[PDB]
């Protein structure tokens, strides 16, 4: 049996998001890609360096916004600009988000030497695609 | 119908009688002329047709009529003219050249017919060195086989013609000046070591004596493109040899030159058996090359085409006349139309397709 | 050398020698006194033969171009 | 086929123009040109910066 | 077609369309086949014709 | 298969399509109208309207082919037919007028009648009675009877021949010696019949 | 901290090969020819041998950057098959999908 990235069935009480519900074979069919860069296109270089930055950028955002992430973040690279689009729960006060945005942007712009912007869409609570 | 069956045979056994009226008609070659004029040089598959049918019959065709016309009007005083029969595979170049060899043979010419010249540049199992020139090599078996056939064809003229010089075969054996040319041939067959040298003496003597008006000389070389090409023979150092190095090839290259008179040279190109040439190469420059083309010019190219509508019907009726096409549907119009498409009127392909049927 | 040249030049080539040698043998058989080289290679017969050889060497070799060469040889060699 | 004088002297004139090796060089000695025309494996950013 | 297709079975495959309609020797075809082997190229021409 | 089960095997008989409509039996007439609304499989590369195409020989060729070498197997069959035609022409020419009449020079007619002679009618088969297998004489079907004749020919020639002989020379000499019912392959047929004779006692065990 | 002591040894091999790249190029060039005296070539054969062993660039092994796995790595991403599949099967690699055909 295949165990890869499959949220298995319980007794109908496990909420799962759209991203979690779909197994790997639905990638490019029902669900898209969380990161969009040009490094895996044919005749393009620096796939390894873009992929390592993604791993870190995801671990950074989880720790910097602990318990405030409704879904996995979406990374969008255009030219040298990096754009982070994160669904965040409305747990923290509003002013705290302004602090963490200023901090996380400046810190990641001086770490990778690129302009990095954070885009936050706040949800009242996690969106449930289906109960499995 | 059998209307072309009337056109599928002619009673003019003698090649001189043939003319445009006889086109597309098969003339039977006399049995004695097969065992004398043609002990060699006939294609291998045609020889199978002569054995099974019990008779050799050569279709009269416009290419071979044009050539016979030039041979009749030959100006022996003028230098020898090289006639080059070039055509695609299976078109009949060899048998068009065999038609010319029959015409000259019946007029009492001296036939110097090399049946295939590719056999002298490949698959040689005995390659010695030459005493005359140590650079050159001698092919004993290849020369011995040709001489035995040359003897059969020209047995009559081997007593009249006589050597003009003394040839020392060995310390204990030499040919006195004045002795018949048959003696040179006899020694070559008797002592295989000298066989490649007897040939050179024969070619040299005939070329010199022909100009004296004693006899006419037809130098008929089929597969001439081998002389100025490449070889697949290797020296003791495992290095490929070149055509000039070989003794038989070097002697022949002189005979195909127009520096003598008293005869005519009839050449043919054959990509079949050729070394290092494409399957779809038939034109004179492609097969001869730059060396071969320059060597032979000015030459007269005679294109051998595929069977025309008249000739294809004559060949189709000839097979039907001998009961060869035993399939029930072959005699029908749908069979004939099918055989025309698959063969494409190519003489060789038509013979191959009909062979199975 | 001749091999190096990309465009055939009939002048001072193997063809010119072979043609000139044949025409020298042809006039000798006629019993004429030995002729000049320029005389033999100035005739129209030799002019056309030059054009045909050059076409085969430069323009390309084909059955059509070979037919043209066949006629020039017949005129040059006085063949019927 | 062999290279005549014209062919060989033209080849040297070309190599002199295009900055190619002009002399007759063995296959072994043509590695010196390769070694000094190609970035070595240890100097490529993929090798020395393989790890984060 | 005799030169391009030295194999009889490939030529027979080109004969099938015309022989079926008894139209042999009544049309002139110009083909341009790229790709595949000898047998796959004869079949592609048969359908095209 | 890449053909859906709704596809129909092609009919490549030239005369059939050109026959007058009235000459066709209504059953045959019905299928034609039905086929206008059906799908038709493409014809195989060896399927043609040629008048010289014989299915029996085409099948015999495929049973000689090794590793998809159709050119070689077809070439060997062509050489065989020629080797048989050339062997009968020699005999015909070297025979009296009376003998000449009997001699058959058609290779296709020597091939078909040679195979039919080798065909075995009844061959032993394993049949289950009382949860036990017995070798009971059975009537061989048409397809199995035809297959066995061809297989026995291609196997005598492939194996039981000298090293320097060639298949067109062994196969020709075997088709001709099975056209007169005096060959090794006929002896193999006589063994299958001889063995069934010994086991006739168990004939009634057959339930069909 | 790197993944393990094996990745640490590999990292040092990569930084000592970069230091000795020009040197090992210049010396090794003197040996890869037939134009210089064999006495010089025999001596250059020892100058290259005398350099430290970790300067040799054939002692570098490509390891997964995240797990330090010596085999199973894909050179375009520098990840093992196990790590690559985890990122690919989660939609985190841009343009990588399963191959159905
Ligand atoms: N004049 C002819 N009379 C009878 N049969 C002929 C004639 N010309 C050609 N053929 C047929 O064509 C076959 C091939 O002829 P031949 O070998 O002379 O052709 P070719 O052009 O010299 O062939 P290749 O290019 O293979 O040397 C013959 O075996 C014969 O069946
Ligand atoms: Mg020939
Ligand atoms: Mg550890
Ligand atoms: Mg290694």
From Swiss-Prot, chain A:
A cellular-component GO term for this protein: mitochondrial small ribosomal subunit
Family per record: Belongs to the universal ribosomal protein uS3 family.
Compartments, as annotated in UniProt: Mitochondrion
Any single GO BP term: mitochondrial translation
Record note on quaternary structure: Component of the mitochondrial ribosome small subunit (28S) which comprises a 12S rRNA and about 30 distinct proteins.
Keyword terms, alphabetized: Mitochondrion, Ribonucleoprotein, Ribosomal protein, Transit peptide
Protein name, UniProt field: Small ribosomal subunit protein uS3m
Chief place where the protein resides: mitochondrion
GO molecular function: structural constituent of ribosome
Superkingdom per UniProt: Eukaryota
Curated annotation (Swiss-Prot), chain B:
Family, similarity comment: Belongs to the mitochondrion-specific ribosomal protein mS29 family.
Record keywords, A-Z: Acetylation, Apoptosis, Hydrolase, Mitochondrion, Ribonucleoprotein, Ribosomal protein, Transit peptide
Domain of life per record: Eukaryota
First-listed, main subcellular location of the protein, grouped into a coarse class: mitochondrion
The reaction(s) this protein catalyses: GTP + H2O = GDP + phosphate + H(+)
Compositional bias per record (Basic and acidic residues), positions renumbered to this chain: 11-25
Modified residues (N6-acetyllysine): 134, 166
Job description of the protein: As a component of the mitochondrial small ribosomal subunit, it plays a role in the translation of mitochondrial mRNAs. Involved in mediating interferon-gamma-induced cell death. Displays GTPase activity in vitro.
Subcellular location: Mitochondrion
Gene name tied to this protein: Dap3
Region (Disordered): 1-25
Organism: Mus musculus
GO biological process: apoptotic mitochondrial changes; mitochondrial translation
InterPro entries xref list: Ribosomal_mS29, Ribosomal_mS29_met
CC terms in the record's Gene Ontology section: mitochondrial inner membrane; mitochondrial matrix; mitochondrial small ribosomal subunit; mitochondrion; nucleoplasm
Protein name: Small ribosomal subunit protein mS29
EC annotation from Swiss-Prot or TrEMBL: 3.6.5.-
Quaternary state and interactors: Component of the mitochondrial ribosome small subunit (28S) which comprises a 12S rRNA and about 30 distinct proteins. Interacts with DELE1. Interacts with NOA1.
Swiss-Prot record, chain C:
Compartment(s) where it occurs, according to its Swiss-Prot or TrEMBL record: Mitochondrion
Membership in a protein family: Belongs to the mitochondrion-specific ribosomal protein mS35 family.
Subunit-structure text: Component of the mitochondrial ribosome small subunit (28S) which comprises a 12S rRNA and about 30 distinct proteins.
Protein name: Small ribosomal subunit protein mS35
Organism: Mus musculus
From Swiss-Prot, chain D:
Subunit description: Component of the mitochondrial ribosome small subunit (28S) which comprises a 12S rRNA and about 30 distinct proteins.
Record's protein name: Small ribosomal subunit protein mS33
Compartment list: Mitochondrion
Lineage: Eukaryota, Metazoa, Chordata, Craniata, Vertebrata
Family: Belongs to the mitochondrion-specific ribosomal protein mS33 family.
Residues of the full protein shown: 2 to 53 of 106
Residues bearing PTM N-acetylserine: 1
């Amino acid at each position: 049996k295949n165990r890869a990235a499959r949220v298995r069935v319980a007794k109908g009480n496990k909420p799962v998001s759209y991203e979690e519900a779909h197994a790997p074979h639905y990638i490019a069919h029902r669900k898209g890609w969380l990161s969009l860069h040009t490094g895996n296109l044919d005749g393009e270089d620096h796939a390894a360096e873009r992929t390592l930055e993604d791993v870190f950028l995801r671990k950074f955002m989880m720790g910097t916004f602990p318990g405030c992430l409704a879904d996995q973040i979406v990374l969008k690279r255009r030219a040298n600009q990096v754009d982070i689009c994160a669904l965040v729960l409305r747990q923290l006060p509003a002013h705290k988000f302004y602090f963490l945005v200023g901090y996380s942007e400046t810190l990641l712009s001086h770490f990778y030497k690129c302009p990095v912007r954070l885009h936050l869409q706040t949800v009242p609570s996690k969106v449930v695609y289906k109960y499995i | 119908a059998e209307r072309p069956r009337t056109v599928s045979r002619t009673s003019d056994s003698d090649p001189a009688k043939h003319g445009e009226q006889h086109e597309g008609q098969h003339y039977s070659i006399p049995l004695q002329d097969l065992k004398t004029v043609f002990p060699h040089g006939l294609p291998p598959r045609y020889m199978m047709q002569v054995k099974t049918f019990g008779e050799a019959c050569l279709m009269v065709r416009k290419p071979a009529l044009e050539l016979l016309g030039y041979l009749k009007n030959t100006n022996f005083a003028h230098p020898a003219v090289r006639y080059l029969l070039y055509g695609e595979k299976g078109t009949g170049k060899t048998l068009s050249l065999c038609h010319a060899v029959h015409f000259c043979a019946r007029h009492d010419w001296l036939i110097l017919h090399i049946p295939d010249a590719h056999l002298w540049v490949k698959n040689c199992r005995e390659l010695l060195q030459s005493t005359h020139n140590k650079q050159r090599f001698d092919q004993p078996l290849e020369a011995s086989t040709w001489l035995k056939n040359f003897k059969t064809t020209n047995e009559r003229f081997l007593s009249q013609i006589k050597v003009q010089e003394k040839y020392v075969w060995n310390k204990r054996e030499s040919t006195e000046k004045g002795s018949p040319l048959g003696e040179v041939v006899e020694q070559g067959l008797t002592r295989v070591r000298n066989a490649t040298d007897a040939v050179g003496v024969v070619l040299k003597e005939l070329k010199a004596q022909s100009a004296l008006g004693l006899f006419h000389l037809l130098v008929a070389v089929d597969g001439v493109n081998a002389l100025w090409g490449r070889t697949t023979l290797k020296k003791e150092d495992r290095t490929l040899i070149a055509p000039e190095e070989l003794s038989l090839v070097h002697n022949l290259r002189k005979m195909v030159k127009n520096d003598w008179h008293g005869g005519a040279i009839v050449l043919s190109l054959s990509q079949t058996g050729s070394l290092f040439k494409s399957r779809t190469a038939y034109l004179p420059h492609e097969l001869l090359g730059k060396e071969g083309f320059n060597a032979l010019e000015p030459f007269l190219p005679i294109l051998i085409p595929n069977y025309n509508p008249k000739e294809f019907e004559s060949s189709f009726q000839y097979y039907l006349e001998n009961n060869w096409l035993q399939h029930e549907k072959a005699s029908t119009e749908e069979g004939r139309k099918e055989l025309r498409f698959l063969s494409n009127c190519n003489p060789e392909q038509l013979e191959r397709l009909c062979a199975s049927l | 050398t001749e091999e190096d040249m990309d465009e055939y030049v009939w002048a001072k080539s193997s063809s010119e020698n072979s043609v000139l040698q044949t025409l020298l043998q042809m006039r000798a058989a006629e019993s004429s006194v030995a002729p000049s080289r320029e005389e033999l290679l100035g005739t129209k017969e030799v002019e056309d033969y030059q054009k045909c050889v050059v076409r085969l060497k430069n323009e390309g070799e084909n059955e059509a171009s070979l037919a043209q060469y066949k006629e020039s040889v017949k005129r040059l060699l006085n063949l019927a | 086929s062999p290279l005549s004088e014209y062919a060989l002297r033209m080849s040297r004139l070309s190599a002199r123009i295009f900055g190619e090796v002009a002399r007759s060089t063995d296959s072994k000695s043509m590695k010196v040109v390769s070694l000094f025309s190609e970035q070595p494996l240890a100097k490529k950013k993929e090798t020395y910066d393989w790890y984060p | 077609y005799l030169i391009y297709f030295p194999i009889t079975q490939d030529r027979e495959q080109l004969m099938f369309p015309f022989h079926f309609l008894d139209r042999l020797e009544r049309h002139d075809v110009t083909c341009t086949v790229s790709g595949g082997g000898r047998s796959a190229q004869a079949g592609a021409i048969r359908l095209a014709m | 298969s890449r053909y859906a089960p709704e596809f129909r095997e092609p009919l490549i008989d030239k005369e059939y399509y050109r026959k007058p409509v009235a000459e066709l039996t209504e059953e045959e007439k019905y299928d034609q109208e039905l086929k206008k609304t059906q799908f038709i499989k493409a014809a195989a590369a060896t399927e043609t309207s040629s008048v010289f195409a014989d299915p029996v020989i085409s099948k015999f060729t495929n049973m000689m082919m090794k590793g998809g070498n159709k050119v070689l197997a077809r070439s060997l069959m062509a050489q065989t037919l020629e080797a048989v035609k050339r062997k009968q022409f020699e005999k015909y020419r070297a025979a009296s007028a009376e003998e000449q009449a009997t001699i058959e020079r058609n290779p296709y007619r020597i091939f078909h009648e040679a195979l039919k002679n080798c065909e075995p009618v009844i061959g032993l088969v394993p049949i289950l009675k009382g949860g036990h297998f017995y070798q009971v004489p059975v009537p061989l079907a048409d397809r199995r009877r035809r297959f066995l004749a061809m297989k026995w020919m291609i196997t005598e020639c492939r194996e039981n021949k000298p090293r320097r002989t060639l298949m067109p020379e062994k196969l020709s000499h075997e088709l001709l010696e099975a056209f007169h019912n005096r060959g090794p392959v006929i002896k193999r047929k006589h063994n299958m019949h001889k063995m069934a004779e010994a086991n006739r006692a168990l004939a009634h065990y057959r339930w069909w | 901290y790197y993944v393990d002591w094996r990745m640490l040894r590999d990292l040092k091999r990569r930084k000592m090969a970069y230091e000795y790249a020009d040197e090992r190029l210049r010396i090794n060039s003197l040996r890869k020819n037939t134009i210089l005296p064999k006495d010089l070539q025999e001596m250059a054969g020892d100058e290259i041998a005398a350099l430290p062993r970790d300067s040799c660039p054939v002692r570098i092994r490509n390891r997964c950057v995240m797990t330090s796995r010596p085999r199973g790595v894909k050179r375009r991403w520098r990840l093992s098959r196990i790590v690559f599949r985890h990122l690919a099967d989660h939609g985190l690699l841009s343009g990588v999908q399963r191959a159905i055909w």
